[PDB]
Design a protein around this ligand. Structure first.
Ligand SMILES: Nc1ncnc2c1ncn2[C@@H]1O[C@H](COP(=O)(O)OP(=O)(O)O)[C@@H](O)[C@H]1O
Lengths: 70, 175, 198, 116, 62, 230
């Protein structure tokens, strides 16, 4: 649609274009990337993965699930 | 281009002057909006008068499609034979065997591990070892189909053995 | 035990319709019946003792290679676990490709278009019938030609190389003994290929 | 000898089968022994999806492929009863006369459309 | 091209192109005729043995 | 109003040559791979035998139209030709003659003629008869007026591609209204009512016969302006 005037006092996001979008994008990407790396480390601290191919779980190891002893 | 078109006219969102009293008898029955308020629900099939009349018309019109479906089903059933499908015959201890094992286990009818004298029956969701309903009938049908397929294979093997033996005897009988 | 040849012949006769007779059209069944009489005689027992063999000294180098290739083909027919995948592919014809399938389809389409032009225009004459028959014969001859060209050009060098490699590995005497009609297929099935890693 | 038997005719333990990461669908079937060598060769010899879907002789994994093909053919013929099915389809009269399968022949109706 | 089973279903299994090795001509003589007869008998016996095995190979796994 | 000459890097007309395969354009140049160029270049086409074969094969020059007024052959001695089908009748005859070969050809070439019938029966009943079969049944291929019997001799097509001419009473002819014959033959007029003029259809009242003429049929003024046909 043909663009029409919008109130400057109104805090609207209707077709808002920022000339300095490059620096803002870089700043919002870099610290976000750092936070994402920290969160990824925190999440990978406690992880479970299927055993590797060719590796069989010997049932005598404590890694095998345990039963409550009455 | 070619004409300095003015700004978008304010008439694009005309203001509605409510000419009828919005009686409390229709509370929330009309979606109110300062521009073009609407009814709460839309009936684009207003050619149909009423719900009973609409249902009657729909059931009258659906008869042709039902008859077409019946014709397709008949054309398929008069030109095809039953197939040989079922659970994997080589595996009887899996989905099939586990059901019979659980029905023979009945561990939900045992005593408490601490001697509490309370069994699985003492619960709203209580174990029942003699249900014999629901998916049990379907499991029995699947087991019967698997048994029929296995018996067919065994009969085929026996008939092939009989054919080979008869051929050997006839070749031997001639001498 | 009874003769495996006679037993297999009797079983095949009993179950030929249970294994080799398929549901076809009227003309298809007519052609199949014509081919049944035209089919060669499959004798269960073959009198192979009447053959008089010649020494491999008479055969030349290419002749001995061809004899080894024939022995390899006979083994592949009998011993299905002798050669590897590459050797089996070398010993057999190559699959029909896009060019061959397209040639067959184009011949069929040309024949269909000619038949449509004939029937639609009712232009059926002696000259048209003769031209159609000649075109069909030429198309059949050409379809047999591409198979011949491909088979020869590809396999003959590959077959010669494979036979020469196997000649040095097994021996011309072994190859000729395999070519001799006195060999037993039962032992040929139990024979081990020295170039089979297994 | 057996169609499901491998070339070396050895039985793989549950630990080895789980170590082979064999699909549960294959484990359900009775052709595990031959599929073990084919799976081992395929894992040891990587081939692309286009390669595997395009290779006809399965490349290097050839003997294991043939053994698995025979075993799978036997399994799929037995589970679908396709042998007796095709036999009765070839000639309804011959199958009924020979008594190959009473259960199969007793409900054998070829259908009017399929050559009566 | 690679999956013509759809064409084999609706239009049936049509005539394939002439696929033959034509390699038996390596030798000549009545030995070649005997070998051809043996090969035909081998093909027929292979069909018969396949039928016998597929009929009896149902009880191999229990 | 193009401004392509103003800018240099703008797309040129010579570049827009690959669009000829999808957009029809007047001929600007003949390609090297063009069929006309191939025909006009190869000396093999310059041989006299090729020219003789070209002049003595395919369509003949005799059957080509040469006048705006044509007279077909006479069915009888004293009849007067009125209407004749030109191309639609020929196409209908060709379509009806397909069953003269396909029906025997399929019978001798189909493994499951029962399946073929179980398929084609609804096709004729629901899709084909209302499209082609009944249209050809109501089609009037040739119509002349026999004055001796004061009747109409009409030759029309028959199921297996045959021709059949019958004489009908002119007094039994009535003008059939398209509205009067609209709803009862809706699908027939919908799918295949395109080739016949719904504004001109006749009916022989003796046996309830419907006579339909092609919208592109050829009508003779002398026959139309006759005392018998008013
Ligand atoms: N408050 C209300 N009470 C009853 N009916 C209403 C009300 N608001 C809207 N309607 C219905 O919605 C329709 C739209 O009315 P509207 O278009 O505003 O009147 P007009 O058509 O005279 O401009 C009317 O026919 C009316 O029946």
């Amino acid at each position: 649609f043909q663009k029409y005037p919008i109130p400057r006092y109104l805090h609207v996001g209707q077709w808002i274009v920022n000339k300095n979008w490059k620096w803002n994008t870089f700043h919002m990407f870099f610290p976000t990337a750092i936070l994402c790396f920290m969160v990824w480390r925190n999440s990978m601290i406690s992880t479970a993965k299927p055993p590797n191919y060719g590796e069989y779980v010997d049932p005598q190891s404590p890694v095998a699930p345990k039963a409550i002893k009455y | 281009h070619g004409w300095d078109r003015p700004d978008v006219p304010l008439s694009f969102n005309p203001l509605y002057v409510h000419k009828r009293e919005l009686s409390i008898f229709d509370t929330n029955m009309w979606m109110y909006d300062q521009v073009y308020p609407e009814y709460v629900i839309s009936y684009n099939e207003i050619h149909l008068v009423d719900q009973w009349k609409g249902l009657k018309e729909s059931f009258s019109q659906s008869a042709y499609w039902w008859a077409m479906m019946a014709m397709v089903f008949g054309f398929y059933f008069i030109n095809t034979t039953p197939r040989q499908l079922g659970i994997d015959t080589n595996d009887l201890k899996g989905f099939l065997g586990e059901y019979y094992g659980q029905y023979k286990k009945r561990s939900g009818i045992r005593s408490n591990f601490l001697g509490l004298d309370v069994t699985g029956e003492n619960s709203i969701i209580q174990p029942n070892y003699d249900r014999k309903n629901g998916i049990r009938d379907v499991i029995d049908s699947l087991n019967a189909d698997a048994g029929k397929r296995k018996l067919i294979n065994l009969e085929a093997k026996n008939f092939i053995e009989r054919v080979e033996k008869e051929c050997e005897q006839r070749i031997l009988k001639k001498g | 035990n009874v003769d495996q040849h006679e037993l297999k012949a009797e079983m095949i006769k009993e179950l030929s319709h249970y294994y080799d007779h398929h549901d076809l059209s009227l003309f298809g069944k007519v052609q199949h019946f014509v081919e049944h009489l035209l089919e060669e005689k499959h004798h269960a027992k073959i009198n192979t003792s009447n053959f008089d063999q010649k020494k491999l000294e008479n055969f030349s180098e290419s002749k001995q290679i061809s004899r080894t290739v024939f022995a390899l083909k006979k083994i592949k027919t009998f011993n299905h676990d002798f050669f590897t995948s590459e050797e089996e592919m070398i010993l057999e014809p190559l699959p029909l490709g896009i060019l061959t399938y397209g040639l067959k389809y184009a011949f069929a389409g040309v024949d269909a278009a000619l038949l449509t032009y004939f029937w639609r225009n009712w232009n059926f004459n002696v000259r048209t019938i003769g031209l159609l028959g000649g075109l069909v014969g030429i198309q059949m001859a050409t379809l047999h030609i591409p198979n011949l060209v491909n088979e020869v050009v590809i396999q003959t060098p590959r077959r010669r190389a494979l036979a020469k490699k196997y000649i040095s590995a097994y021996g011309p005497q072994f190859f000729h003994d395999i070519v001799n009609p006195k060999y037993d297929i039962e032992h040929l099935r139990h024979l081990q290929n020295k170039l089979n890693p297994y | 000898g057996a169609w499901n038997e491998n070339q070396q005719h050895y039985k793989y333990s549950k630990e080895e089968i789980e170590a082979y990461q064999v699909p549960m669908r294959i484990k359900a079937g009775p052709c595990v022994d031959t599929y073990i060598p084919l799976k081992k060769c395929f894992q040891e010899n990587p081939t692309s999806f286009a390669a595997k879907m395009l290779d006809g002789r399965k490349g290097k994994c050839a003997k294991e492929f043939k053994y698995y093909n025979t075993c799978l053919n036997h399994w799929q013929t037995y589970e679908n009863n396709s042998h007796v099915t095709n036999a009765y389809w070839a000639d309804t009269s011959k199958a009924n006369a020979d008594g190959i399968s009473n259960t199969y022949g007793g409900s054998f109706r070829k259908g009017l459309a399929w050559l009566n | 091209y690679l999956e013509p089973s759809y064409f084999h279903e609706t239009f049936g299994h049509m005539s394939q192109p002439p696929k033959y090795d034509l390699i038996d001509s390596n030798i000549n003589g009545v030995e070649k005729k005997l070998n051809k007869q043996i090969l035909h008998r081998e093909h027929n016996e292979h069909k018969l043995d396949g039928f016998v095995s597929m009929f009896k190979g149902s009880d191999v796994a229990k | 109003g193009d401004i392509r000459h103003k800018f240099s890097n703008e797309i040129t007309d010579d570049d827009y040559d690959y669009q000829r395969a999808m957009h029809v354009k007047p001929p600007k140049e003949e390609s090297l791979f063009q069929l006309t160029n191939i025909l006009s270049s190869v000396p093999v086409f310059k041989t006299r035998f090729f020219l003789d074969f070209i002049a003595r094969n395919l369509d003949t020059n005799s059957a080509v139209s040469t006048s705006d007024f044509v007279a077909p052959p006479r069915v009888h001695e004293n009849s007067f030709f009125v209407y004749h089908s030109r191309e639609l009748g020929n196409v209908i005859r060709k379509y009806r003659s397909l069953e003269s070969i396909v029906l025997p050809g399929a019978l001798l070439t189909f493994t499951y003629p029962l399946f073929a019938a179980f398929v084609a029966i609804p096709s004729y009943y629901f899709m084909f008869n209302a499209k082609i079969y009944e249209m050809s049944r109501r089609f009037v291929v040739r119509m002349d007026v026999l004055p001796h019997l004061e009747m109409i001799s009409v030759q029309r097509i028959g199921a297996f591609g045959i021709l059949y001419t019958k004489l009908h009473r002119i007094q039994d002819l009535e003008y059939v209204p398209f509205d009067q014959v609209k709803e009862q033959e809706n699908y027939l007029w919908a799918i295949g009512g395109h080739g016949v003029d719904n504004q001109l259809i006749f009916k022989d009242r003796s046996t309830g016969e419907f006579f339909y003429f092609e919208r592109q049929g050829v009508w003779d003024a002398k026959g139309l302006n006759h005392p018998l046909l008013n």
